[PDB]
Design an enzyme around this catalytic site. Structure first.
Site, mmCIF file in Angstrom:
data_model
loop_
_atom_site.group_PDB
_atom_site.id
_atom_site.type_symbol
_atom_site.label_atom_id
_atom_site.label_comp_id
_atom_site.label_asym_id
_atom_site.label_seq_id
_atom_site.Cartn_x
_atom_site.Cartn_y
_atom_site.Cartn_z
ATOM 1 N N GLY A 49 35.550 49.749 43.749
ATOM 2 C CA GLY A 49 35.880 49.840 45.164
ATOM 3 C C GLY A 49 37.072 50.733 45.383
ATOM 4 N N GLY A 51 40.004 52.182 48.441
ATOM 5 C CA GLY A 51 40.689 51.997 49.726
ATOM 6 C C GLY A 51 41.471 53.242 50.096
ATOM 7 N N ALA A 52 42.312 53.115 51.113
ATOM 8 C CA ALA A 52 43.144 54.232 51.566
ATOM 9 C C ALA A 52 44.207 54.598 50.537
ATOM 10 C CB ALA A 52 43.808 53.887 52.891
ATOM 11 N N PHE A 53 44.870 53.577 50.000
ATOM 12 C CA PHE A 53 45.966 53.760 49.051
ATOM 13 C C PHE A 53 45.546 53.866 47.578
ATOM 14 C CE2 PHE A 53 48.169 51.385 52.592
ATOM 15 C CZ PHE A 53 48.849 52.504 53.075
ATOM 16 N N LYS A 55 42.421 52.310 44.308
ATOM 17 C CA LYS A 55 41.112 51.830 43.930
ATOM 18 C C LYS A 55 41.154 50.892 42.736
ATOM 19 C CE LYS A 55 40.357 56.314 41.796
ATOM 20 N NZ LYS A 55 39.504 57.084 40.850
ATOM 21 N N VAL A 56 40.023 50.233 42.523
ATOM 22 C CA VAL A 56 39.799 49.354 41.409
ATOM 23 C C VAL A 56 38.607 49.942 40.665
ATOM 24 C CG1 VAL A 56 39.237 46.984 40.747
ATOM 25 C CG2 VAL A 56 40.700 47.439 42.711
ATOM 26 N N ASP A 174 44.787 36.249 52.941
ATOM 27 C CA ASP A 174 43.455 36.757 53.200
ATOM 28 C C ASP A 174 42.433 35.969 52.336
ATOM 29 O OD1 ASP A 174 41.366 38.420 54.053
ATOM 30 O OD2 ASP A 174 42.178 40.206 53.065
ATOM 31 N N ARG A 178 34.840 37.095 50.466
ATOM 32 C CA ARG A 178 34.899 38.488 49.975
ATOM 33 C C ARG A 178 36.030 38.737 48.928
ATOM 34 N NH1 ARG A 178 36.608 38.385 55.359
ATOM 35 N NH2 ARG A 178 38.870 38.623 55.398
ATOM 36 N N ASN A 179 37.014 37.831 48.858
ATOM 37 C CA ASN A 179 38.107 37.847 47.878
ATOM 38 C C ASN A 179 38.037 36.797 46.776
ATOM 39 O OD1 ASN A 179 40.266 38.885 50.470
ATOM 40 N ND2 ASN A 179 39.841 39.906 48.545
ATOM 41 N N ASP A 192 43.073 39.168 44.796
ATOM 42 C CA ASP A 192 43.525 39.986 45.903
ATOM 43 C C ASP A 192 42.822 41.345 45.753
ATOM 44 O OD1 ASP A 192 45.188 41.183 47.971
ATOM 45 O OD2 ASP A 192 46.484 41.923 46.354
#
Ligand SMILES: COc1cc2ncc(-c3ccccn3)n2cc1-c1cnn(C)c1
Ligand SMILES: [Cl-]
Ligand SMILES: [Cl-]
Ligand SMILES: [Cl-]
Length: 310
Positions: A49, A51-53, A55-56, A174, A178-179, A192
């Site tokens: 996955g 993101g903006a900042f 990834k994994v 959160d 999904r987490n 997280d």
């Protein structure tokens, strides 16, 4: 402007009212070098996955768990821009996770790479992905067979994971399906996943200045006052129970996130009993959604009520 922040946060209580706490920051604490792992021993695979900042990514790690043995791992990293503020956010998560200790129901840190290159945090791999997609994949396969006791076990394990975080003085800002991740033996683990996610990937988060808010999972005190405590997590947990016992239906189905949603919650609106829940499990859910946080059960209580039903 907007920054990276783990949704797993350590806190310190300063009084007995819910707003009397502050967030523990590891920026000034020192990183323990026994966690340092050589980057040469990582063989990278697919992007899990992005993101903006950051990834994994999936990877193979030689010698992380035992000598001579390659295992599968998941690696958090930043994207190449490497802004120095984002770098320290990720060091702070590292230091935080090194202090937690491990637990069966948490996605545990295995090591890190911080000295000779870009920062990598290295985590246990969970082969079956996030719980939300897993439940959804098994809608036409419920009695690869998914049963009612499996769902009850998932519930129990997530509560167990949250008991751990409570005892270690953390909150999850959160908590949602999904987490939660799924691995061998029907084992589930809280994580997280925030670095791997964007505003394009998810309409379940509402943009509000710097914040990205999972509105339908948030307790009233979180929505209205910005307060996140372990009793807020109990509310979130209730919502996650509904997700489990509906096989991954979006909460408040068909209801959009707008100013009327805020009013619903203010006035005491609560979801109905989902198909796969017993009435006793729905009674548990309903008490997690007590408006007053003192009336909600605790994670030790929930660990019992669901230790029983198994
Ligand atoms: C195969 O799916 C996974 C396996 C997996 N193993 C570990 C992690 C992880 C994710 C975050 C932080 C630490 N670890 N992880 C994430 C995923 C994953 C990727 N996408 N989605 C929706 C879940
Ligand atoms: Cl998260
Ligand atoms: Cl996602
Ligand atoms: Cl997001």
């Amino acid at each position: 402007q907007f920054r990276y922040e783990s949704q797993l946060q350590m806190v310190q209580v300063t009084g007995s009212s819910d707003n009397e706490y502050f967030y523990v920051d590891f920026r000034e604490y020192e990183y323990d070098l026994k966690w340092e792992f050589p980057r040469e021993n990582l063989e990278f695979g697919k992007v899990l996955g992005s993101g903006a900042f950051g990834k994994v990514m999936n990877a193979t790690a030689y010698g992380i768990s035992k000598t001579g043995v390659s295992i599968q791992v998941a690696v958090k990293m930043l994207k190449e821009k490497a802004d120095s503020s984002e770098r320290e956010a990720l060091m702070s998560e590292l230091k935080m996770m090194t202090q937690l200790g491990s637990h069966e129901n948490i996605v545990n840190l295995l090591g890190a790479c911080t000295l000779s290159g870009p920062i990598y945090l290295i985590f246990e791999y969970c082969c079956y992905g996030d719980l939300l997609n897993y439940l959804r994949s098994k809608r036409e396969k419920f009695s690869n067979v998914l049963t009612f006791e499996d769902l009850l076990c998932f519930a129990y394990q997530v509560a167990k994971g949250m008991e751990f975080l409570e005892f270690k003085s953390c909150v999850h800002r959160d908590l949602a399906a999904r987490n939660v991740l799924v691995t061998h033996g029907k084992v589930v683990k809280i994580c997280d996943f925030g670095l791997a996610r964007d505003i394009m990937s998810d309409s379940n988060y509402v943009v509000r200045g710097n914040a990205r808010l999972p509105v339908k999972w948030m307790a009233p005190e979180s929505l209205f006052e910005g307060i996140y405590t372990i009793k807020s997590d109990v509310w979130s947990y209730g919502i996650l129970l509904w997700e489990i016992f509906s096989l991954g239906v979006n909460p408040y189905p068909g209801i959009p996130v707008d100013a009327n949603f805020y009013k619903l919650i203010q006035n005491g609106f609560k979801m109905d009993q989902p198909f796969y829940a017993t009435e006793e499990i729905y009674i548990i859910m309903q008490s997690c959604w007590a408006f007053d946080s003192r009336k909600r059960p605790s994670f030790p209580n929930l660990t019992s009520f669901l230790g029983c039903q198994l």
